């Protein structure tokens, strides 16, 4: 239920990363120290936390 908004685009570098653009909204599933794990359009993957701000 925690939502984050992308501040800059991020392109996946592994098969378990998310892709997204500036202003895309990501549901945050888990948070580590550098990377978060989230969901967009039913796809789940990792992305760096520095790329998003919480809504």
């Amino acid at each position: 239920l925690l939502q984050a908004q992308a501040l800059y685009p991020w392109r996946a570098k592994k098969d378990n990363h998310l892709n997204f653009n500036k202003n895309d909204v990501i549901t945050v599933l888990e948070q580590q120290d550098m990377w978060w794990f989230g969901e967009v359009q039913g796809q789940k993957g990792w992305f760096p936390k520095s790329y998003v701000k919480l809504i």
């Binding site: 580590q32 120290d33 550098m34 990377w35």
Partner: peptide, 5 residues
């Protein structure tokens, strides 16, 4: 100290 991820 942060975790690894």
């Amino acid at each position: 100290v942060m975790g690894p991820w």
